[PDB]
Amino acid sequence: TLTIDGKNKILATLTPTTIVLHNVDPTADPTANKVTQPVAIFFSEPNNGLIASEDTVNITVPASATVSHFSLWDDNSKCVATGALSSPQFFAEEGIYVISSVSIDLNK
Amino acid sequence: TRVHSYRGVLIITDELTVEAGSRVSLSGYVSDGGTSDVFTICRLLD
Numbered sequence: 001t002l003t004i005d006g007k008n009k010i011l012a013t014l015t016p017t018t019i020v021l022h023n024v025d026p027t028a029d030p031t032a033n034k035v036t037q038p039v040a041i042f043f044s045e046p047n048n049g050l051i052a053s054e055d056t057v058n059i060t061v062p063a064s065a066t067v068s069h070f071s072l073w074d075d076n077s078k079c080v081a082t083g084a085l086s087s088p089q090f091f092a093e094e095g096i097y098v099i100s101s102v103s104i105d106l107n108k
Numbered sequence: 109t110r111v112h113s114y115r116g117v118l119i120i121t122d123e124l125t126v127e128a129g130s131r132v133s134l135s136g137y138v139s140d141g142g143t144s145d146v147f148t149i150c151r152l153l154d
């Protein structure tokens with residue numbers, strides 16, 4: 001299998017910085033149909049081939065908006081990763097979605 | 109007639125490739141307040 005040391009070094013250049021929530025799956029186009037505004041997410045150092053979020057993230061979603069899928073970005077506007085949150089949520093009144101833990105890992 | 113032979117080296121060719129994967133895990137929930145400091149009852153006034 002791949003080496004953990006290799007898995008740690010390879011993951012040290014990802015460095016996602018902003019997180020954006022989408023109502024639809026952004027796999028086809030992660031540059032379209034955004035809902036929230038880019039909110040800063042800070043990651044830890046690569047350990048055991050798995051980076052994790054340092055602090056919790058609060059994303060202010062506008063009213064009458066739905067979030068179902070999430071996406072991460074870097075400094076040069078380059079979508080490193082996309083994913084789907086647990087379940088869709090409809091914010092009737094202006095609310096907040098909190099990110100408890102993001103764990104990008106490569107250890108299969 | 110000689111019949112004398114020769115000898116070479118062991119030459120072998122193989123194609124090797126190692127692959128890996130990736131998965132992103134996220135856990136979030138609707139905000140119901142948040143861990144605050146000095147959680148006390150309050151009486152606002154205008």
